[PDB]
Design an enzyme around this catalytic site. Structure first.
Site, PDB file in Angstrom:
ATOM      1  N   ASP A 197     -70.165 -34.399  78.358  1.00 15.51           N
ATOM      2  CA  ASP A 197     -69.516 -35.292  77.404  1.00 15.51           C
ATOM      3  C   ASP A 197     -68.794 -34.431  76.352  1.00 15.51           C
ATOM      4  OD1 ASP A 197     -68.813 -37.216  75.495  1.00 15.51           O
ATOM      5  OD2 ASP A 197     -70.739 -38.237  75.544  1.00 15.51           O
ATOM      6  N   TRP A 219     -76.433 -39.974  71.986  1.00 18.68           N
ATOM      7  CA  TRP A 219     -75.568 -41.075  71.561  1.00 18.68           C
ATOM      8  C   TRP A 219     -76.099 -42.341  72.254  1.00 18.68           C
ATOM      9  CZ3 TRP A 219     -70.476 -42.964  73.852  1.00 18.68           C
ATOM     10  CH2 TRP A 219     -69.665 -43.565  72.875  1.00 18.68           C
ATOM     11  N   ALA A 278     -66.417 -34.751  73.444  1.00 19.91           N
ATOM     12  CA  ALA A 278     -65.741 -35.640  72.493  1.00 19.91           C
ATOM     13  C   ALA A 278     -65.310 -35.037  71.149  1.00 19.91           C
ATOM     14  CB  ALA A 278     -66.612 -36.877  72.249  1.00 19.91           C
ATOM     15  N   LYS A 317     -61.259 -38.647  68.450  1.00 19.62           N
ATOM     16  CA  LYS A 317     -61.503 -37.919  67.214  1.00 19.62           C
ATOM     17  C   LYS A 317     -60.619 -36.723  66.925  1.00 19.62           C
ATOM     18  CE  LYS A 317     -65.755 -39.837  68.337  1.00 19.62           C
ATOM     19  NZ  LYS A 317     -66.756 -39.633  69.376  1.00 19.62           N
TER      20      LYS A 317
END
Ligand SMILES: *Cc1c(COP(=O)(O)O)cnc(C)c1O
Ligand SMILES: *Cc1c(COP(=O)(O)O)cnc(C)c1O
Ligand SMILES: O=C(O)CCCc1c[nH]c2ccccc12
Lengths: 388, 394
Positions: free
Chosen positions: B208, B127, B210, B243
């Site tokens: 991470d 990302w 997400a 999300k």
């Protein structure tokens, strides 16, 4: 690796909050007659309206929403708002705007030094220390008269070179409560443009001093005079939405070109820190400010808050007078805002918290909103009992 | 003074959406969108979420300042959601953050505080925001192979070799699940191995997380994270609710600091709250309270997991459909990876030229790295996309 971490110093004003017949006069929050921080009518109405209208929560504006940006610039600067030269950035409260302001300023000038009032909101120097920014202090509080030492303030500000940043509280000076008159502001603007120092205005209590429009008079004066100025605004207190975390930074530039630069560097600042700013609070403010009906009830409620507090200051002043036979405490009715420096020495200060049970900041800063007909007399007797 | 500002570059998204809107073509398609979109082309608010806001509207009596590091109900609820029964409170420090990006930023600031000579290792690719934040902080950044452009899978052998060079105290950034932008993920056996290389080198893992709930399932997607958490003494988890909860704009996430002992937890927790205070003081409350409400209220939690699952199942079906369509058109299983990938993104492995050919000839838009968004596909768009991939010679 994390075991190598060293303990950091705590925020004393918040420390009290953890500690707390008890009379809480600490944390800067408006409290009603019954020791409650209510949700303002308009805000609640805005939230209901929002619940019915929003159809998505997708990522929105990196620098905040256009509506919020517009409503805020007009709230603060009134008709002095020249969008053509103004960059706006929605932040995480007023504190976030201060950090964002210091970052922007440092980007613009690595050798930046910041001047702060003596005394000033502790979190100011904290953020500055953390960043490793050189901090200097200008004289402000006239210790004996409990007012402002303007002659001393002017002397110090005159020493500031250009590129240096001067931090001014727009109104309701925290912690002292002592403020500058419009005449004094014009005087300050004279020094600023003569030294070329960039003013950073901290606007966190617009509406708690003398009125929405009047509390911004000084800020509007600097904006009308100094070509470049930064204003960090907070909606935590005047909209009573402390926990939502909503405010913004306004960068006044000399022209549109520099404006496009600042705007691009402000948004980039949000992106590298947390991406988009929080939406709920900024949306509550936008809705209140752009809806005639809601702005009207809001202004009215704030005016009530404002007037009531002034009414209280007047009481304490009177109580003390008729409870000492002197007027050393007349300063209470003269100060503007939520706070005031009682002047009490640390020894007495501590005593009152133990036996009496009243909680006020170690520098004798009292949140007058925490007082009322019930506690005022006890407080008066308290300071007498604790002496000086 | 502000004139000395070096012009900063726009987020690119603008130039992407700008060109997409400029297109006069009727049936143009957009697969570059970074958020979830349902059949109607919308990004809906989840039912459980809308219900939480109603409840909050009736019970919230004040908006005074709350917890500097978040509310206990939130921190606790998040820790259980991510680590499950393995939530070892005594040694866990938690921080409510402004989105997962906040969590990442703070995690980096935290690590650098404990180790000034910190070096971060990121996947290839990753990302873009990751790199930007580190470049901004002035942190040394090293890459470790990951996406195999040929098989569209994971070059695990390469990843292993590159990670072996990590030193004691370096940070290795790993995606907990649903790798963005590739879609290629590690198997639990591959996770087990990576854990061994971390113990060996003594590098601190920053995970991470997400997309928990967008791959195989809430529990399944956290398996990797839980493995690392059970075998590594110090772990840093940067979670997002944007999300899987559909509250992108509310900015809700949290950083989890897993330490070797309680005294350390105390140091971490304090340093975490300190970081918040020097950045923006208290964290944003609204979205965090929606999350805690849903998770703690059986009725809502059930409804939420149900909606997330439907979303996950739907996306997976689109994947199988695309793969199937591509098999009929090519006469091979060359594109089967589209079915093995997990998450809402997938890098097709098309070169920029080919990505440009698809747009000009087929009117289909996607990121330059050939990252597509699965949620953007449907019965009508799939045929077109399959035909284009094949026609452009990918
Ligand atoms: C309240 C306050 C702020 C901003 O507080 P936020 O809750 O971060 O909006 C900034 N400066 C002073 C002096 C304040 O009292
Ligand atoms: C979404 C996402 C995040 C977190 O973003 P926030 O919008 O700040 O919650 C972090 N990493 C990756 C790879 C993501 O896709
Ligand atoms: O009481 C005050 O001085 C301002 C209101 C409380 C407050 C808001 N943000 C903060 C950051 C650090 C310390 C205190 C605060």
């Amino acid at each position: 690796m994390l075991g190598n971490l060293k303990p950091q110093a705590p925020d004393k004003i918040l420390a009290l909050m953890g500690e707390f017949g008890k009379i809480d006069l600490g944390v800067g929050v408006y409290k009603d007659a019954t020791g409650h921080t209510p949700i303002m009518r308009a805000v609640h109405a805005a939230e209901q309206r929002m619940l019915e209208t929003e159809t998505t929560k997708t990522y929105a504006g990196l620098s905040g929403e256009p509506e919020f940006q517009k409503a805020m610039g007009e709230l603060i600067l009134g008709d002095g708002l020249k969008s053509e030269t103004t960059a706006t950035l929605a932040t995480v409260g007023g504190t976030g705007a201060l950090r964002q302001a210091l970052e922007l300023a440092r980007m613009a000038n690595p050798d930046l030094r910041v001047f702060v009032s003596d005394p000033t909101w502790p979190n100011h120097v904290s953020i500055m220390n953390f960043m490793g920014l050189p901090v200097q202090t200008y004289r402000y509080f006239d210790a004996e008269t409990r007012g402002v030492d303007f002659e001393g303030m002017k002397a110090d500000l005159a020493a500031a070179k250009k590129g240096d940043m001067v931090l001014l509280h727009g109104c309701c000076h925290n912690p002292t409560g002592a403020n500058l008159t419009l005449d004094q502001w014009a005087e300050i603007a004279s020094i600023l443009e003569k030294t070329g120092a960039l003013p950073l205005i901290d606007l966190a209590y617009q509406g708690f001093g003398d009125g929405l429009e009047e509390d911004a008079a000084g800020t509007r004066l600097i904006a009308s005079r100094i070509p470049e100025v930064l204003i960090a605004a907070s909606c935590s207190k005047n909209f009573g939405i402390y926990r939502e975390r909503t405010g913004c930074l306004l960068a006044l530039c000399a022209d549109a070109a520099t404006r496009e630069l600042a705007q691009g560097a402000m948004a980039f600042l949000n992106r590298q820190t947390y991406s988009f700013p929080p939406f709920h609070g900024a949306k509550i403010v936008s809705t209140v400010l752009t809806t005639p009906e809601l702005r009207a009830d809001w202004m009215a409620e704030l005016e009530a808050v404002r007037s009531g507090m002034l009414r209280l200051r007047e009481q304490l002043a009177g109580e003390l007078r008729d409870l000492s036979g002197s007027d050393r405490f007349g300063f209470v009715a003269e100060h503007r805002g939520m706070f005031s420096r009682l002047g009490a020495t640390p020894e007495q200060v501590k005593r009152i918290k133990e036996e009496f049970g009243i909680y006020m900041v170690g520098d004798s800063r009292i949140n007058i909103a925490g007082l009322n007909d019930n506690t005022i007399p006890i407080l008066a007797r308290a300071i007498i009992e604790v002496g000086v």
